[PDB]
Amino acid sequence: PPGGGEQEPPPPPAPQDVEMKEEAATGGGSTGEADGKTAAAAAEHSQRELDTVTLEDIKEHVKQLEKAVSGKEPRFVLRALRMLPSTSRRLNHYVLYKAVQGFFTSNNATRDFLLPFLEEPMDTEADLQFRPRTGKAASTPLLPEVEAYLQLLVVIFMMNSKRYKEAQKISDDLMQKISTQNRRALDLVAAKCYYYHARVYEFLDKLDVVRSFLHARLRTATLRHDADGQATLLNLLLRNYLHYSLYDQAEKLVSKSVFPEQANNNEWARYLYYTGRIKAIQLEYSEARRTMTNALRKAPQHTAVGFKQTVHKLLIVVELLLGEIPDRLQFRQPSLKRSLMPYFLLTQAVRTGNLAKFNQVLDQFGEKFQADGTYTLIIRLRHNVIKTGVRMISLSYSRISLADIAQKLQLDSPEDAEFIVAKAIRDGVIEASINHEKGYVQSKEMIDIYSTREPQLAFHQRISFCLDIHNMSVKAMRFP
Amino acid sequence: YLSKIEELQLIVNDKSQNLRRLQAQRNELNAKVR
Amino acid sequence: DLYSRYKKLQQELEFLEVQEEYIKDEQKNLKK
Amino acid sequence: GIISLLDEDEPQLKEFALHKLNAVVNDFWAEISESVDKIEVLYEDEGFRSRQFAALVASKVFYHLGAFEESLNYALGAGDLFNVNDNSEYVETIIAKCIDHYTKQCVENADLPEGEKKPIDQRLEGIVNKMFQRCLDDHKYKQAIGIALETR
Amino acid sequence: MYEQLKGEWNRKSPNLSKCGEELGRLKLVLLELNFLPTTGTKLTKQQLILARDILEIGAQWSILRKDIPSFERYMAQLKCYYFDYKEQLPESAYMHQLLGLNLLFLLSQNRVAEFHTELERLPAKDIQTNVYIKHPVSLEQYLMEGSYNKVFLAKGNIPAESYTFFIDILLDTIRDEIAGCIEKAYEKILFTEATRILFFNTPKKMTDYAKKRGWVLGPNNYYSFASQQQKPEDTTIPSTELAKQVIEYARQLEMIV
Amino acid sequence: MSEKKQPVDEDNWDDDNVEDDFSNQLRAELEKHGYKMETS
C-alpha cells in the first residue's frame, strides 16, 4: 500500500507528455497546414495522425482512469479558438491544465459530463470553421470512449456523439468545401469513425436505417467530391451485404465504382479480397483465384495478423474447387497451427482419390463450417474429388475395367462408372475409349499438339507480366 | 452550385502537372547530357 | 469573382494540353 | 423483388408499385437496371395514367447508375412533377445535365439557327429561365449575368 | 373482419372466376395495407399472415394451372416475406418446401449461380434438416457428376406435394443429357439398355432419338460414326495468333513513347 | 503504422507435398513389407 502509493504518481505523466504532444504537434500541423498543401485530402500530419491512431490502438483504449487522459478530455474539448490571437492564452492553457493536473488530482467525468463534454465547441460563440480540428477532436475523444468497450447506457451517448458527428456531416456537406478538402480530411476521419461506428453497430442490431444513411454517404461522393471516401465507404457498404445473403452482389457486378485508383495499399488490397470472396461464391474460380492470390500477397505486412490468415485460408478453397492444389502451410506460422490443421486435413483428404476420407470430414467439422461460413464447398467439392481420382487413375492405368475402379472408389455399382467416366470424357478430362460390351476403358497418349500450342500460351502470360513489371518499374522510377 | 463544383473537379486534374514535372526532369536530363 | 475564377482556368487547362503535347516531341527530337 | 408485380394490367397495382419503388429504392438502388423496359412500358403508353412518375423513378435510378443522358431524357419527359421538385441537391444534377447540354446546344445554335434549328422542349429551355428566376428574384446579379453569358 | 378470406379454403377450386375473386381480394388487400413492413403496429398483419396463406394456396392453384411467371411472382412475394426486414418471423405452412419449389425450378432453369446464392439465407436449415431442401440438393448432389437412374429413384420417392410440372422439366433435361453424352465412346450399345436408361420400351421416341439424333438404328445396335479434326490448316491460326502475340511482345518492348 | 484493421480475429515443404502422398497411407512403412512377405 505505500508501494502502490508510489506506483500511483509515475503512470500519469509520461502518457500525459507524449499522448499530449502527439496531437499537439501533429494536429497543429494538420489543422494549420491543411490551409495550403494542394493535395490535402490527407496532409502529412494526417498520415501522422493515422500513425498515432496506430499507436493508441495498442497504447491506450479506455478514457484512462488513474487520472491521466481524464483531464485531457475537458482540456482538449474546451477550445473556442475564434482567431489566432484568441488562441495564445489557450496555448498557455495546454500547459496550465497540466499544472492543474499536477497540483491536485484530476476529475474523471465519465458517462455524466460526456454530453456537456460536447458543448465546449460552442464556448462563447465558438467556431464551425476548422471542421478537421473539430472532426479530429470529435474522433480522438469520442472513439476511445468506444474503445472503453462499455456497452452500458452510453452506447446511446456513443450514438449521440455520432449524432453530433452527423452534425459534423452537416458541416461537412454545407460549410464551404471549396478546395480546402476539409471534407476529404474528414473522409479519412470518416473512414476511421465509420469503422468504430460500425463496431458500435456490431454490438447492436442491423443498421438498415443507417444502411440507407450509408447508401447516401456513398452516393454523396463522385459528384460533390471524388477521392478515397468512395473506397472506404465501398468496403464499409460491403462488410455486411456480404454477411447478409441477398441481392447486393449483382449490385457488386453492376457497380461502376470498382476503381478508386489508390487506397494506401490497405483498403485496395482488402477490396480485392472482398470482391474475390464475392466472385468465389458464384462458382467462378479462375477470375476469383487471381485476385485472391494478389490480395494475399498484396498486404502481407505482419507475421500471423489474423485476417491475413483468413485470406490465406479462403484462398485455397477455390483451388480445392479447381483440381490443381498447392500445399497451404508454405506460409505456416507458430500462431497458426490451430487454425490451419483441420483445414489442412481437409486438403489432405482432397489430395488423394479417396472419398471415404472426404465424407467423414463434413460430419467431423461441420461446426467449424458453421463458424467459417463456407458450406458451399461440401455441396460441390465431391465433384472435384472424384475428378481428381479418375484423373489420377486414368493417368495410371492404360486400360482399366469400370467394375474395378468403381469399387476402388466406393461407387458401389459398375453401371454408373460408365456415367462418371462418360462425363470424364464429356467434361473433357480424359480421351479414353470404352467398349461397352466388355466394360474396359483403354487410354492412349500423345504429345506435340501440347508443344505446338500449350507452352507458348503460358509464355505469353509470363512475358506480359514481366513487361508490365518493366512498365511499372520505369514509370515509378521516373519520379526523380 | 453550378459555378462551384466545376472548379473543384477541374483542380482534381492537376496530376497532369506532376506528369509535366516528370517530363520536365526528363527534358532536363536529355538537354544537360547533350 | 467566380466567373473570372472559372473562366481563367480554361487557359491553364489549354496550357497543360500544350506542354503535354510539346514535351513528347521534344523527347523524340533529343535522341536524334 | 417487386419486378413480377410490374406485369399486371390494371394501374392500381402500378401506382402502388411506384409508391413502394420510391420507398425501398434506398436499398434496391441498382435494381431497375434489370427493369429498364418495364419502366419504359409504364412511361411510353398513352393509355396509362401515372406515366410521368415512371419517368421520375427512372430519373432517380438512372441517376444512381450515372446515366446522365438517360436522366437527361427523363429530365425532359418526367413532366410537371419534375419541375415542381427543386428543393434538394438532385437539382444541381438536373441543372448540370440540362444546362451543360443547353450551353453546348447554344454553341450549336451559335453556329446556325438561321435555318435547320433543333426544336427545343419547353422544359429544356423552361428550366433555363425558370431556374434563372432564382437569380431574377434572389438579389444576385453576377450569377445572373454569368448564366446570361453562358446561354449565349 | 376481412370478409370470407378463407372461403373455398379446404375443398378445392376448379374455377378461375373464383380465382379472379381471389386476385381481386388480393388487390383489396393491397389497397388496404401493404406488403412492406409498416413499422408502427406490427400486429395488424393478420390480413398479411392469412394473405401469405392464401398466396400459398394461390401458388398451389398456380402450379396446378401452370402459370409459371405468376408462379415466380407469388414465389418472389413469399420469398421476400420469409426474408422480411422486420425480424419477428413467425412460422407458416409451406415455408420449408416453398423454397424447395423455387430450388426445383431454378435448378430446372440451370441457374446454378442462383442455385448456390439462394442456399445462403438458411445456413443450417438447408443442411442439417428440411429434407425437402436437403433431398432436392442431394438430388443435385447426384446431378453433380453423371448419375442418371439414381436420380430417378430419388424422383420416384417424394412423398411431398406434386413437384411434377418441374421434375418433368428435370426428366427432359436428363433426356437431352443422355442425348448429349451419347456421342462419346459408346462405340456400340445394344438397344434395350438404351431403352432402360433413356425411357420408353418400344416407342416412337426411339425413332425420335435414332432420327433426330444420329445413332443409326441397325441390328440391335446404335452405331457410332467417326469424325476427325486433323489440325491440318492450322499451322496458320497458330501462325497468325503468334503474329498477334509477337507483334504484341515487340510492341511492348518497342515502347518508347 | 500499418495497424491492419482488426474486426476479424527447402527443409519443410517439397517433402510435405511428398508427405501428403505419405500421410494417410503407410506412415512408418517398414513392417508392412515383413507383414506381407508371408501373406501371399
Side-chain angles (χ1 to χ4, degrees):
Chain A
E6 290 181 355
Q7 285 175 356
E8 287 180 349
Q16 290 173 353
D17 289 331
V18 297
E19 189 267 332
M20 183 77 192
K21 293 188 292 293
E22 281 180 355
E23 66 259 8
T26 301
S30 73
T31 305
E33 295 166 354
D35 296 332
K37 195 174 187 179
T38 63
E44 68 277 13
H45 290 86
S46 300
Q47 287 99 26
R48 182 60 67 195
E49 183 68 28
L50 298 172
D51 296 334
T52 58
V53 169
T54 68
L55 188 137
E56 280 98 11
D57 280 329
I58 56 172
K59 177 65 174 67
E60 57 90 22
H61 294 86
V62 71
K63 80 278 286 183
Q64 282 287 316
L65 307 165
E66 193 61 28
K67 277 75 177 172
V69 184
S70 300
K72 295 278 186 292
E73 296 101 13
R75 174 188 284 101
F76 280 100
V77 71
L78 200 144
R79 294 294 177 270
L81 306 185
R82 193 264 301 160
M83 193 178 287
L84 184 63
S86 299
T87 65
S88 65
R89 293 182 182 178
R90 294 290 182 267
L91 290 173
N92 288 318
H93 279 91
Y94 285 119
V95 182
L96 290 174
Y97 290 121
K98 285 186 179 182
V100 173
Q101 291 187 357
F103 291 161
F104 288 162
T105 62
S106 299
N107 288 318
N108 195 4
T110 59
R111 303 181 185 179
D112 287 331
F113 291 102
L114 294 178
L115 298 177
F117 283 157
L118 298 171
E119 294 178 352
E120 283 87 6
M122 200 183 289
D123 286 335
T124 315
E125 290 90 6
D127 280 337
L128 51 87
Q129 185 68 43
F130 292 101
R131 66 179 188 265
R133 181 181 69 87
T134 64
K136 183 170 65 66
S139 67
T140 53
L142 300 171
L143 298 178
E145 186 265 320
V146 181
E147 271 108 3
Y149 291 113
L150 44 93
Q151 297 297 317
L152 184 146
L153 189 146
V154 193
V155 174
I156 191 62
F157 294 164
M158 289 178 186
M159 184 62 208
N160 288 318
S161 69
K162 297 186 288 286
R163 292 293 183 184
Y164 290 168
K165 188 176 70 66
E166 292 179 358
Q168 296 293 321
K169 178 177 168 65
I170 293 167
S171 68
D172 200 2
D173 291 330
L174 276 71
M175 294 297 107
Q176 284 83 20
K177 78 296 298 181
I178 303 298
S179 292
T180 313
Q181 293 177 357
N182 295 326
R183 179 177 288 165
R184 295 178 180 180
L186 286 177
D187 286 332
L188 277 83
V189 174
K192 294 184 183 293
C193 77
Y194 288 161
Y195 293 125
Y196 292 107
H197 182 81
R199 288 179 179 88
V200 174
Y201 289 112
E202 287 171 352
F203 296 118
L204 68 99
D205 297 335
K206 61 184 182 294
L207 58 156
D208 287 337
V209 178
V210 190
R211 290 292 167 182
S212 178
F213 177 79
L214 190 59
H215 285 95
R217 184 59 182 170
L218 178 65
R219 174 57 62 189
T220 192
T222 322
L223 194 275
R224 301 291 295 273
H225 287 285
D226 194 0
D228 198 7
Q230 196 172 9
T232 59
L233 289 164
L234 183 57
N235 274 325
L236 286 166
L237 184 141
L238 197 153
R239 64 183 173 93
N240 194 359
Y241 290 165
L242 190 150
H243 174 74
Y244 294 159
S245 68
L246 205 54
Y247 165 70
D248 296 332
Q249 295 97 23
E251 193 274 331
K252 293 169 185 66
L253 294 174
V254 305
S255 292
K256 198 70 74 176
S257 293
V258 185
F259 55 107
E261 293 292 328
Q262 70 267 15
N264 298 115
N265 202 4
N266 194 1
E267 192 279 335
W268 186 256
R270 69 186 181 90
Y271 175 67
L272 265 68
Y273 171 60
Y274 287 128
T275 189
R277 183 186 287 111
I278 289 299
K279 294 186 291 295
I281 201 66
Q282 283 93 21
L283 279 73
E284 181 66 31
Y285 293 154
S286 178
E287 183 181 359
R289 65 173 177 88
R290 57 176 182 86
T291 184
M292 291 297 287
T293 303
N294 195 3
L296 183 66
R297 67 182 173 88
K298 189 170 173 64
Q301 298 294 320
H302 281 284
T303 56
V305 79
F307 64 100
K308 182 174 175 64
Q309 297 302 324
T310 303
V311 51
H312 181 72
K313 186 184 294 181
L314 190 65
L315 186 141
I316 66 103
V317 171
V318 296
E319 295 179 350
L320 291 175
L321 291 172
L322 285 178
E324 61 175 2
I325 186 70
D327 187 8
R328 54 96 59 223
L329 59 91
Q330 55 187 356
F331 294 100
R332 66 174 169 87
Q333 300 300 319
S335 296
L336 177 55
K337 184 173 72 66
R338 294 177 183 175
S339 63
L340 75 89
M341 282 297 291
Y343 186 69
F344 179 72
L345 191 274
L346 178 62
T347 187
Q348 180 61 255
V350 179
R351 288 174 72 182
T352 62
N354 191 2
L355 282 79
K357 184 68 175 178
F358 177 71
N359 290 318
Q360 188 178 1
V361 177
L362 173 64
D363 186 73
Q364 183 65 41
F365 292 143
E367 296 294 324
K368 183 66 175 176
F369 291 163
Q370 295 184 2
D372 296 329
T374 178
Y375 299 156
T376 62
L377 65 88
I378 203 72
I379 194 66
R380 71 179 74 94
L381 205 151
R382 182 180 177 89
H383 179 80
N384 196 6
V385 170
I386 192 64
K387 291 299 182 292
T388 301
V390 70
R391 182 183 296 111
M392 180 177 177
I393 298 170
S394 65
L395 196 146
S396 174
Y397 293 89
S398 178
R399 185 173 185 271
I400 196 68
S401 177
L402 49 86
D404 294 330
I405 187 173
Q407 287 78 13
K408 185 170 69 176
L409 296 178
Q410 66 176 2
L411 189 62
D412 203 5
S413 63
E415 69 273 13
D416 55 353
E418 294 179 354
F419 295 163
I420 273 89
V421 177
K423 288 190 183 177
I425 305 167
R426 173 63 64 194
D427 295 331
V429 174
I430 200 61
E431 191 271 337
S433 178
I434 307 100
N435 202 168
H436 292 276
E437 181 69 29
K438 58 182 65 62
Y440 290 160
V441 185
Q442 58 180 355
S443 66
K444 66 185 73 174
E445 192 273 332
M446 70 179 289
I447 39 91
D448 204 0
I449 199 62
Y450 183 79
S451 69
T452 303
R453 178 67 78 204
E454 184 65 31
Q456 67 186 359
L457 300 176
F459 297 133
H460 183 74
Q461 292 183 353
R462 297 295 179 91
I463 298 302
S464 66
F465 182 69
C466 293
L467 290 176
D468 287 329
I469 292 170
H470 180 77
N471 292 318
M472 292 296 106
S473 71
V474 176
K475 298 299 289 184
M477 185 173 173
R478 291 293 183 270
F479 290 99
Chain B
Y1 286 104
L2 188 145
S3 66
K4 302 288 181 66
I5 311 168
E6 294 178 354
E7 294 180 354
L8 304 181
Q9 290 181 356
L10 191 147
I11 294 171
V12 170
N13 296 318
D14 294 337
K15 303 288 103 176
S16 297
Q17 181 178 0
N18 292 319
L19 295 177
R20 289 182 66 248
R21 183 72 61 85
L22 303 180
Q23 296 182 358
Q25 287 184 354
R26 182 176 296 171
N27 194 2
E28 179 182 1
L29 288 173
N30 287 319
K32 285 184 178 179
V33 168
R34 182 257 169 84
Chain C
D1 298 333
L2 296 174
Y3 177 74
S4 65
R5 293 181 184 178
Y6 179 71
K7 182 66 179 177
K8 291 177 183 178
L9 292 177
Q10 298 178 358
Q11 294 178 355
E12 292 179 353
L13 190 274
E14 286 168 346
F15 291 164
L16 64 88
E17 288 176 352
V18 165
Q19 288 105 31
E20 196 274 332
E21 190 271 333
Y22 169 61
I23 308 298
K24 299 294 186 183
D25 294 333
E26 286 288 330
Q27 180 180 1
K28 190 261 180 297
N29 195 3
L30 285 175
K31 295 180 175 67
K32 291 181 180 180
Chain D
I2 52 96
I3 295 97
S4 61
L5 296 174
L6 293 171
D7 291 329
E8 196 271 331
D9 295 330
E10 294 176 353
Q12 60 180 357
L13 187 55
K14 300 296 181 289
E15 281 101 13
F16 290 160
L18 52 84
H19 192 197
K20 287 176 254 74
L21 278 174
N22 57 358
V24 296
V25 62
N26 49 3
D27 194 3
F28 292 166
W29 260 349
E31 182 66 33
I32 315 296
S33 300
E34 294 83 3
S35 176
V36 174
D37 54 352
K38 295 173 69 66
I39 296 299
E40 290 291 330
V41 173
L42 292 176
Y43 177 70
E44 295 293 331
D45 187 71
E46 293 178 353
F48 187 72
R49 295 180 61 87
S50 297
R51 56 180 290 166
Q52 293 86 18
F53 196 79
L56 268 78
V57 294
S59 302
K60 296 291 181 68
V61 67
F62 285 105
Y63 175 69
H64 175 262
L65 271 70
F68 295 99
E69 290 83 5
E70 188 70 30
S71 292
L72 180 63
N73 293 118
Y74 287 145
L76 294 176
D80 197 3
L81 294 172
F82 181 78
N83 300 120
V84 71
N85 292 319
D86 54 357
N87 194 1
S88 177
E89 293 183 356
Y90 184 70
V91 66
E92 62 183 359
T93 69
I94 69 174
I95 67 171
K97 294 182 290 182
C98 180
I99 297 300
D100 197 1
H101 177 71
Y102 181 78
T103 185
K104 68 183 181 67
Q105 187 66 255
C106 290
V107 172
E108 190 273 335
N109 297 118
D111 195 3
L112 188 63
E114 193 182 4
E116 62 181 2
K117 295 185 289 294
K118 303 298 184 293
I120 291 169
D121 193 3
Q122 290 84 19
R123 291 183 293 271
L124 180 60
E125 64 185 1
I127 69 167
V128 174
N129 51 4
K130 185 162 68 178
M131 193 61 66
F132 183 72
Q133 298 298 322
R134 299 293 179 89
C135 294
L136 288 171
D137 295 332
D138 285 329
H139 181 75
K140 186 66 177 293
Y141 302 105
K142 292 188 287 184
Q143 289 292 107
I145 202 68
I147 273 87
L149 268 68
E150 287 293 327
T151 187
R152 298 292 189 269
Chain E
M1 200 178 178
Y2 296 103
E3 297 284 326
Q4 284 80 18
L5 189 58
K6 300 190 298 298
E8 293 291 326
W9 183 66
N10 55 5
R11 181 179 172 269
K12 272 173 74 70
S13 292
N15 288 317
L16 303 176
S17 178
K18 188 176 292 295
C19 296
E21 179 66 27
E22 182 69 29
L23 182 59
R25 183 69 179 87
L26 293 168
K27 180 71 72 171
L28 291 173
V29 171
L30 293 171
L31 269 75
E32 275 171 347
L33 182 62
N34 212 356
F35 58 88
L36 207 71
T38 313
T39 299
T41 311
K42 178 70 176 179
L43 291 175
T44 190
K45 295 186 181 292
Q46 292 295 319
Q47 71 266 14
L48 285 179
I49 299 302
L50 276 72
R52 296 187 301 116
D53 294 331
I54 66 177
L55 293 179
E56 285 176 350
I57 201 167
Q60 295 297 318
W61 293 346
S62 296
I63 198 64
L64 186 146
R65 76 189 69 185
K66 190 181 67 66
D67 195 0
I68 309 300
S70 296
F71 180 77
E72 71 181 3
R73 181 179 69 184
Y74 291 106
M75 181 64 217
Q77 290 173 353
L78 294 168
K79 180 173 71 177
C80 292
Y81 291 159
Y82 298 120
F83 195 76
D84 195 2
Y85 288 166
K86 293 294 185 292
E87 192 176 3
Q88 294 300 110
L89 275 301
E91 206 267 328
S92 71
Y94 290 161
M95 178 176 72
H96 291 88
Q97 60 271 17
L98 185 61
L99 280 80
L101 291 169
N102 195 4
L103 197 69
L104 184 61
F105 183 59
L106 185 142
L107 192 154
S108 295
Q109 290 183 353
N110 196 358
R111 296 293 188 273
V112 58
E114 294 292 325
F115 183 79
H116 293 286
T117 194
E118 194 273 335
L119 290 171
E120 185 67 28
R121 71 183 70 90
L122 291 178
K125 296 292 289 183
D126 299 338
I127 300 301
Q128 294 301 108
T129 180
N130 198 357
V131 72
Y132 299 111
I133 301 295
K134 182 176 71 177
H135 181 269
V137 301
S138 179
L139 185 66
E140 182 57 33
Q141 185 181 3
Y142 289 159
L143 269 79
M144 286 291 107
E145 296 86 3
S147 182
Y148 289 106
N149 292 116
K150 183 69 175 176
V151 168
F152 293 120
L153 293 173
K155 184 180 284 186
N157 194 2
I158 299 101
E161 72 273 16
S162 177
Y163 290 165
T164 307
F165 291 88
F166 295 152
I167 67 174
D168 294 337
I169 304 171
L170 199 144
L171 289 174
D172 196 4
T173 200
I174 294 173
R175 293 288 179 86
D176 62 356
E177 186 182 0
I178 294 110
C181 72
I182 185 72
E183 295 293 327
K184 302 290 102 176
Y186 297 160
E187 293 294 325
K188 66 178 184 66
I189 49 98
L190 197 145
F191 178 74
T192 191
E193 287 84 2
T195 280
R196 291 181 179 92
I197 276 90
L198 280 168
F199 281 162
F200 284 94
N201 46 7
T202 308
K204 303 298 184 289
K205 194 184 73 168
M206 64 178 282
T207 301
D208 194 3
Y209 283 114
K211 275 75 173 177
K212 180 178 181 291
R213 297 293 92 197
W215 296 98
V216 177
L217 188 67
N220 203 0
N221 195 356
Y222 284 163
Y223 289 96
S224 180
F225 63 96
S227 296
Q228 296 295 323
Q229 53 180 354
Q230 303 171 0
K231 198 58 68 177
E233 291 289 326
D234 292 326
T235 319
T236 52
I237 297 175
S239 295
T240 189
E241 84 178 7
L242 282 177
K244 181 181 178 182
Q245 287 181 356
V246 190
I247 279 169
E248 178 67 29
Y249 297 133
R251 194 258 189 273
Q252 295 186 358
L253 177 54
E254 178 75 22
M255 301 301 284
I256 195 169
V257 302
Chain F
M1 68 285 198
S2 177
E3 58 93 12
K4 292 282 285 185
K5 307 178 293 297
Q6 190 58 255
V8 180
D9 195 2
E10 191 271 333
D11 197 12
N12 287 313
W13 186 70
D14 195 2
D15 204 2
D16 195 14
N17 188 6
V18 177
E19 194 272 332
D20 288 331
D21 195 4
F22 281 122
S23 298
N24 54 3
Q25 298 178 358
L26 50 90
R27 298 180 185 272
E29 178 63 25
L30 195 58
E31 297 87 4
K32 179 170 175 285
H33 307 88
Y35 287 164
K36 293 196 287 184
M37 284 176 184
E38 65 272 13
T39 58
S40 297

